[PDB]
Amino acid sequence: SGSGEPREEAGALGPAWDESQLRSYSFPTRPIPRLSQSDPRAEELIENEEPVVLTDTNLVYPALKWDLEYLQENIGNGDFSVYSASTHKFLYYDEKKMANFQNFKPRSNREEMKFHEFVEKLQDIQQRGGEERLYLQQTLNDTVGRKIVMDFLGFNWNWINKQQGKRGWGQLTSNLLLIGMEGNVTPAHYDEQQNFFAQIKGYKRCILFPPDQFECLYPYPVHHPCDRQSQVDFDNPDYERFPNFQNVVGYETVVGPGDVLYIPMYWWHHIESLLNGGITITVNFWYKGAPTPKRIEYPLKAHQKVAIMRNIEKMLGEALGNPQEVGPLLNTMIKGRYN
Ligand SMILES: O=C(O)CNC(=O)c1c(O)n(OCC2CC2)c2ccccc2c1=O
Ligand SMILES: [Zn+2]
């Protein structure tokens, strides 16, 4: 039990969720702390780059009223990236890297459309009873209607801007809106930026793994379109190819409306929209991490070693003139020499 006992909602409305809405996996977890932003422990966790769920930021307070109808009326007439998938797992592909690996075609199609088309496409699926799932993921721009601009202005910019200043982070790079169907799964991956994951509607089970568990999670090659994702099928883990997955230990939480999960830079995260929980809405805030310090302190952090491993794969990819020779060169380098 990583998320703990399901939290009770105000007004004696009882269980927000129950454990049968969670998917079953083979690894143990422990709870990410649920704290208040006023708690000095929450401050220590963020500076030390450990995950924390803040319960009372009011970061996206004006957005707590968002649903499909309100958004459809006010978000405007931009294009929204909608990812499709025949299964519940939404594996993403770097379309630019799809050239290096000709021997693969994607399984989660992206399709640009207008917001009203996505809403029509969604309740079509619920009435046809079909198995197809959709996931709208669109960076917020200024092509957005007046009432949503007002809501944006209503975010707690005082709090998050001071968090950016106190941690030495870079600038805010994007505000990703995510709207998803129940049961949708974003499979385990890590990002290179600091993330405040602000939950708006519905419930999302977030399972995180620290950077020192690189060896248990087996990311794709840097040049692979699925760069930064685990190769391990959490529903059917191949212990023969991925034996250290038997040693993986996660940090787990379930975020609901009003909650803000800090996902530290380089922390693995597996996110799922709770089964039979309806649609989920999230806004993400991405900050570039703080610049690498003056004097390098040893021993290195785990995330610096990941960054080192990424640079070696990149450097080899361009030195050899072909990303596909990285593998054989690296094996030639270690076989009988370092293993
Ligand atoms: O689904 C959830 O609740 C959590 N989603 C994520 O964590 C998530 C992510 O971090 N990235 O990388 C973006 C970084 C480059 C700026 C993606 C990229 C392409 C397509 C999908 C995603 C994605 O879903
Ligand atoms: Zn991510």
From Swiss-Prot:
Binding locations of substrate: D142, Q171, L172, T173, D191, E192, Q193, R228, Q229, A290, N311
DNA repair among keywords: no
Gene symbol of the encoding locus: HIF1AN
EC number: 1.14.11.30, 1.14.11.n4
Cofactor: Fe(2+)
Catalysed conversion reaction: L-asparaginyl-[hypoxia-inducible factor alpha subunit] + 2-oxoglutarate + O2 = (3S)-3-hydroxy-L-asparaginyl-[hypoxia-inducible factor alpha subunit] + succinate + CO2; L-histidyl-[ankyrin-repeat domain protein] + 2-oxoglutarate + O2 = (3S)-3-hydroxy-L-histidyl-[ankyrin-repeat domain protein] + succinate + CO2; L-asparaginyl-[ankyrin-repeat domain protein] + 2-oxoglutarate + O2 = (3S)-3-hydroxy-L-asparaginyl-[ankyrin-repeat domain protein] + succinate + CO2; L-aspartyl-[ankyrin-repeat domain protein] + 2-oxoglutarate + O2 = (3S)-3-hydroxy-L-aspartyl-[ankyrin-repeat domain protein] + succinate + CO2
Annotated positions binding 2-oxoglutarate: Y135, T186, N195, K204, N284
GO biological process terms, semicolon-separated: negative regulation of Notch signaling pathway; negative regulation of transcription by RNA polymerase II; positive regulation of myoblast differentiation; positive regulation of vasculogenesis; regulation of vascular endothelial growth factor receptor signaling pathway
Protein name (database record): Hypoxia-inducible factor 1-alpha inhibitor
Pfam family, one: Cupin_8
Alphabetized UniProt keyword annotations: Acetylation, Cytoplasm, Dioxygenase, Iron, Metal-binding, Nucleus, Oxidoreductase, Transcription, Transcription regulation
Class of the enzyme per the UniProt entry, highest EC level: oxidoreductase
JmjC domain ranges (all copies): 132-302
PANTHER family per record: HYPOXIA-INDUCIBLE FACTOR 1 ALPHA INHIBITOR-RELATED, HYPOXIA-INDUCIBLE FACTOR 1-ALPHA INHIBITOR
Residue ranges, annotated region (Interaction with VHL): 1-115
Main function: Hydroxylates HIF-1 alpha at 'Asn-803' in the C-terminal transactivation domain (CAD). Functions as an oxygen sensor and, under normoxic conditions, the hydroxylation prevents interaction of HIF-1 with transcriptional coactivators including Cbp/p300-interacting transactivator. Involved in transcriptional repression through interaction with HIF1A, VHL and histone deacetylases. Hydroxylates specific Asn residues within ankyrin repeat domains (ARD) of NFKB1, NFKBIA, NOTCH1, ASB4, PPP1R12A and several other ARD-containing proteins.
Domain of life: Eukaryota
GO molecular function, one term: transcription corepressor activity
Annotated stretches, region: Disordered: 1-41
Site (Important for dimer formation): L330
Lineage: Eukaryota, Metazoa, Chordata, Craniata, Vertebrata
